[PDB]
Write a protein that binds this ligand. Structure first.
Ligand code: GDP
Length: 317
């Protein structure tokens, strides 16, 4: 039997990361010369991150720890504002390192929810030593941590338990177009990704628009859509790892001011899940299968996917 799966969700929820984990888990996986191709992305990824922080400092009027950094900051722009593609040198590595290591820098980094920063910023910045290597080759985790925006519709074929899957990743824009999505009227299952850590975040170009709510508006659209009456809706409340470290420092009340429970991973996450499930009108007839995930963790995605495939077998094939 063939099974079609539509990955839906706002931008940066984990959709393309899940696609990657399918290749790693169910297919060949990323080879040594495959990862070498993402080496440039790792560089571009890291360079942009530090630049965003260095730039927010201005915006938030935060000052460097050591004033010697001001010079490093300038040097960052001379090297970055020169090259045309993500590269890395021993000099670029020192400037970045000294900057990351700075006090004012970390302060601005602790205020990241005030600007736009890639989730993977700390990961690469903290491993700059390793990725700065002259003959560095990205590891699988480095590839999963990259951020490449999806222009086209990505598709993946993989077999699993004598069931052949065809995964479609259409990206945020199209996830949103209410008419267009009709072409997928008969999908077996839709996997909806939600970024848990966005709860205290806005959209860059919509500075006052909370992302968790924008994603709730989209769940509501897909969820209660006539074309998916017979499609299983699976919810990946993704980035459980970042939510954990965040919740204990930023209150959910920033997202849902009416929240009254406590701010622990357990209560807050359960609240988020209920909020999304409740948007489902066909509560009787239609069922939502929710899972908490860490898309960058291959083992987690693997166990969760095993589960998902067992449900689809139970009612859709
Ligand atoms: N640590 C962490 N990073 C993740 C997780 N899921 C995905 N990411 C990162 O999120 C950024 C955007 O995710 P991506 O999969 O590209 O999202 P898309 O826009 O929905 O395709 C990338 O840097 C991903 O590696 C997660 O659960 N935790």
């Amino acid at each position: 039997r063939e099974v079609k799966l539509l990955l839906l969700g706002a931008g940066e929820s984990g959709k393309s990361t899940i696609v990657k984990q399918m290749k790693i888990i169910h297919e060949a996986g990323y080879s040594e010369e495959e990862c070498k191709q993402y080496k440039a992305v790792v560089y571009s990824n890291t360079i942009q991150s530090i630049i965003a922080i260095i730039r927010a400092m201005g915006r938030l009027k935060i000052d460097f720890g050591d004033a010697a950094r001001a010079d490093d900051a300038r040097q960052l722009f001379v090297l970055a504002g020169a090259a045309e593609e993500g590269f890395m040198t021993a000099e670029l590595a020192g400037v970045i390192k000294r900057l990351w290591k700075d006090s004012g820098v970390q302060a601005c980094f602790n205020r990241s929810r005030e600007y736009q920063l890639n989730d993977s910023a700390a990961y690469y910045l903290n491993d700059l030593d390793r990725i700065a290597q002259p003959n560095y080759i990205p590891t699988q985790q480095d590839v999963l941590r990259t951020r490449v925006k999806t222009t086209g519709i990505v598709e993946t074929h993989f077999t699993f338990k004598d069931l052949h899957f065809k995964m479609f990743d259409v990206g945020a824009q199209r996830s949103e177009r209410k008419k267009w999505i009709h072409c997928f009227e008969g999908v077996t299952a839709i996997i909806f990704c939600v970024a848990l850590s966005d709860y205290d975040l806005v959209l860059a170009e919509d500075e006052e628009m909370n992302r968790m709510h924008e994603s709730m508006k989209l769940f509501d659209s897909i969820c209660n859509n006539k074309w998916f009456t017979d499609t299983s809706i699976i919810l990946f409340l993704n980035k459980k790892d970042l939510f954990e470290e965040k919740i204990k420092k930023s209150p959910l009340t920033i997202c849902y001011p009416e929240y009254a429970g406590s701010n622990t991973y357990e209560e807050a996450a359960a609240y988020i899940q209920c909020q999304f499930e409740d948007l489902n009108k066909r509560k009787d007839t239609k069922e939502i299968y929710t899972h908490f995930t860490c898309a960058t963790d291959t083992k987690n995605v693997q166990f969760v996917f095993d589960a998902v495939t067992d449900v689809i077998i139970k009612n859709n094939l």
